[PDB]
Amino acid sequence: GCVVIVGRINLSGDTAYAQQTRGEEGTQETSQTGRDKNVVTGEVQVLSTATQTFLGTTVGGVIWTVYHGAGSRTLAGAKHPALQMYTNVDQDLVGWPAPPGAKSLEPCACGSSDLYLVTRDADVIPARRRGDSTASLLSPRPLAYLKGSSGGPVMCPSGHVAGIFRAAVSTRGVAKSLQFIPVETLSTQARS
Ligand SMILES: CC(C)(C)[C@@H]1NC(=O)O[C@@H]2CCC[C@H]2OC/C=C/C(F)(F)c2nc3ccccc3nc2O[C@@H]2C[C@@H](C(=O)N[C@]3(C(=O)NS(=O)(=O)C4(C)CC4)C[C@H]3C(F)F)N(C2)C1=O
Ligand SMILES: [Zn+2]
């Protein structure tokens, strides 16, 4: 089937919030068709398949997300579904051309180690960067609270995107660190 945009998160300005755009029935129908009547607004899109829900982040004109969520599927669009311009299983990364209305986030270059994840519910979860692709949670939290936020943005204090949430370091139901796809990896991405 198709990946469907069932919601959005606008990060510019005040404390962000999530905005639902479709329901169960409409998302199933639109994953069957591939025709998305709704307009695209925001920098972070809530994405769903017939079975899974996750996030995508708009950077450099492209909606990026995780392969373990979208696989090789297409993204519903105005007229027809959009084909993936980027696919990399090793990086767990996939990318579709950003349609009209999708606002891109600017890459981070400040070197700030004080990052935060924006979840699918628009919660802010801070973490201290300790490597190229890892950041330690300031407080451990149950893994279930992070589920469904893969593909969401890992942000710097300035509002620029340092990375894309990919996986969690967890033990016995409790997450201690986030692992993400560095933003520098999305610019050096081969338009297949
Ligand atoms: C134990 C754990 C937390 C479940 C697991 N940790 C884990 O593997 O830790 C190791 C050690 C340190 C980093 C990581 O190195 C391995 C990298 C794995 C990977 F991620 F690159 C990945 N490449 C794939 C490529 C092709 C096909 C399948 C793939 N499957 C993968 O990983 C899988 C998926 C990923 C996941 O659940 N991501 C999140 C999420 O919310 N998803 S989701 O939206 O609900 C949903 C399932 C709908 C899409 C953000 C974390 C949230 F839950 F916090 N996983 C397992 C984990 O995070
Ligand atoms: Zn920055």
Q: What residue segments make up the domains of the chain, in order of their start?
A: 2-97, 114-188
Identify which of 6, 66, 89 to mutate to test ligand 1's pocket (most ligand atoms within 8 A of the CB). Answer: 66
If phi over 0 gives left and psi between -120 and 50 gives alpha, with beta otherwise, what is residue 103?
Answer: beta
Expressed in Å, this structure's resolution amounts to 2.0
Domain 114-188 CATH superfamily:
Trypsin-like serine proteases (2.40.10.10)
**What backbone torsions phi and psi does residue 187 show, to the nearest 5 degrees?**
-80, -35
From start to end of the chain, where are the E strands? 2-9, 18-20, 44-48, 53-59, 62-66, 74-75, 86-88, 93-97, 114-118, 124-129, 134-142, 153-155, 161-171, 174-182
Domains 2-97 and 114-188 share a fold: yes
- For the domain made up of 2-97, the CATH class stated in words is mainly beta
Q: Is 64 in the pocket of ligand 1 (CB under 6 A)?
A: no
Experimental method: X-ray
Cα separation of 50 and 48, whole Å? 7
Q: Residue 55 CA: which ligand 1 atom is closest? A: 44
> Has 110 been labeled as part of a binding site?
yes
